[PDB]
């Protein structure tokens, strides 16, 4: 029960921002929520494409790299490039047919628009210092360490898109399908895009904020500059996607947008708390891997660990979650160089 | 059976533009088809903000303007506004969930975007020179006339969508809903998709380029010009949108992509002929809404219709099919200076 345009003339400053009417006329003289018309607006001002960075000299510096710098650099690039990847359709495939506000539509039309210019990047550096960019993007496929990644993260979209799928063409309720019985409930599809929704800014908030930190190591020992470059114009970006997805949990869990969705996000708060928690460890794990040959000037398994902990409190707090550790500094306060913007806090 | 990352490493070179596997790693290095990597890379190049735009004398002009010619102004602005709000979801809604190459899901991505950036003009322009916005979006919805044109434009959309999710979901068969006979048809829905891109292309091709015409025409008075302004960053883009789709189909029908879409686009190539006369049909007798009340100096229900049938000619070719006209010159050879870019022939 999809449509393009939805032939109802709506108020749509009174919609949900998910699951009701599907967006017909794309308007943006007034907004239910302006946080999106800004994300929008702020997006949309910090355009730049990849091929204005010179990354010529990162070429030099990885063919220097020992050999397990080189794999500390590398593995980090492939991470990188599986989760925009999945980033730069995403959105748009999960989200869209469930949104029903203007304005939150064009802005995660914004978004994975945004995530593409990231994979763009990524193809960018990849050309630029290694000799066969085809060796580099296939293991990014059979990587036992990034498809365990790539499987749980895709897995929060994919059972989403699959369960919208059932939802509008099925409607709710109890169906016969080919003799087997199929239940559509708008609670549960509810759910699912909240810990889908939760599972992302995990990704964008935590995730890639781990790869920051490893990008920017390189750079303060004045190595793959170039690529760190790229790094700050990606995180800036990064920190708008993140907020983005702060306010869509925090409305929904308010109550303000759907009261079903308040208690939704009660009875999944665990659940969430579990997924974040996962993901945190998952990245300890990731840094085991990274470090398995020896470390870097600066940083190590342990340092990286540190940083995954005091990243994933401040997140956590920020969409309303319990916190996993012990309350602890920062441990690499000179990240925060690489990590600011004068227009959004990175 | 959607995956948001396929898990099998496949050679992406390979693989046809639709109905493939499902894209997993998003690479730039290289293309089957490099038109779609020129086309991202121009689109991107041609990055435009509406607001940098001065609408601000078109309020002046517009009041100025007799009723009728309000309503010709006011009239086309809606029928734009209605054709790229779903523009800006529908490529991405409709074709992403479909397409196995990368070059093209990114096209499609960076396309939709462009269209929302369209969108967002729109209302820029309305804001300007109406006193109540509402009530020009709200007729958008309602009027009689414009909804006509949704309805149908909107139908090769939705259905294409809504099979994809049966063959998503179901697989290639015949099967059973709640008791009912669902039979999936991988040849059917390849059907959809080639009518679906034929309305795309006589929709961005034809449609948009009468509605050019309409405000240039105003432009040509030396009124609406900050709108004029708009229409010529809007027009650069729409070359390229149809060009897109105009390698699509002629990649379809050639058989070099996929030799079962050969026989599917012979099979239905009255179907597609008669698509594209029926949507000029319809232009023209918009061209009679339009000037119902009286007509403006150099454009009326008489000049418009002949450009109708001139530039419907023309697309048709590109895409192969018989012309529906008497081989004409260009009524308006002054329209050339408005669609005129260095980057790209508009």
């Known amino acids: 029960a999809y449509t393009t345009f939805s032939q109802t003339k709506n108020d749509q400053l009174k919609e949900p921002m998910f699951f ?3 967006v017909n006329v794309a308007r943006y003289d007034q907004q239910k929520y302006d946080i999106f018309e800004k994300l929008i607006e702020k997006q949309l001002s910090f355009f730049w494409r990849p091929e204005e960075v010179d990354v010529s000299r990162d070429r030099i510096d990885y063919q220097a790299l020992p050999e397990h710098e080189k794999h500390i650099f590398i ?14 359709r995403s ?7 469930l949104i029903s506000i203007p304005e939150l539509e064009t802005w995660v039309e914004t978004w994975a628009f945004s995530e593409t210019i990231h994979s763009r990047s990524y193809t960018h550096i990849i050309r630029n210092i290694v000799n066969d960019p085809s060796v580099v993007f296939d293991d990014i496929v059979t990587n036992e360490q990034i498809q365990k990644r790539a499987e749980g993260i895709s897995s929060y979209y994919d059972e989403l898109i ?9 409607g709710e309720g109890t169906h016969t399908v080919n003799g087997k019985t199929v239940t559509v409930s708008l609670r549960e599809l509810k759910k699912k895009l909240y810990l889908c929704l939760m599972s992302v800014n995990a990704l964008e908030a935590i995730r890639f904020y781990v790869s920051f930190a490893c990008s920017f190591a390189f750079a303060e020992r004045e190595l793959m500059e170039g690529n760190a470059k790229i790094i700050r114009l990606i995180a800036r970006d990064e920190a708008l996607h993140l907020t983005g997805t702060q306010h869509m949990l925090n409305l929904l869990r308010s109550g303000a947008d759907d ?16 997924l974040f928690v996962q993901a945190a460890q998952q990245e300890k794990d990731w840094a085991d891997y990274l470090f398995r040959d020896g470390s870097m000037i600066g940083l190590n398994k ?7 902990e005091y990243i994933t409190n401040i997140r956590m707090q920020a969409v309303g979650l319990d916190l996993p550790f012990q309350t602890r500094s920062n441990p690499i306060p000179w990240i925060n160089t690489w990590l600011v913007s004068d227009n959004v806090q990175v």
Chains 1, 2 share one sequence.
Do not use: R
């Open 91 to 97: 959105p748009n495939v999960a989200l869209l047919p």
């Open 75 to 88: 593995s980090n690039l492939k991470y990188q490039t599986l989760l925009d990847s999945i980033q730069g």
């Open 259 to 274: 009261p079903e969705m308040a208690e939704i996000a009660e009875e999944c708060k665990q659940e969430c708390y579990d």
């Open 162 to 170: 699959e369960m919208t799928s059932y939802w509008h063409l099925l």
């Open 302 to 308: 342990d340092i990286l660990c540190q940083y995954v």
């Open 20 to 22: 009701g009417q599907p």
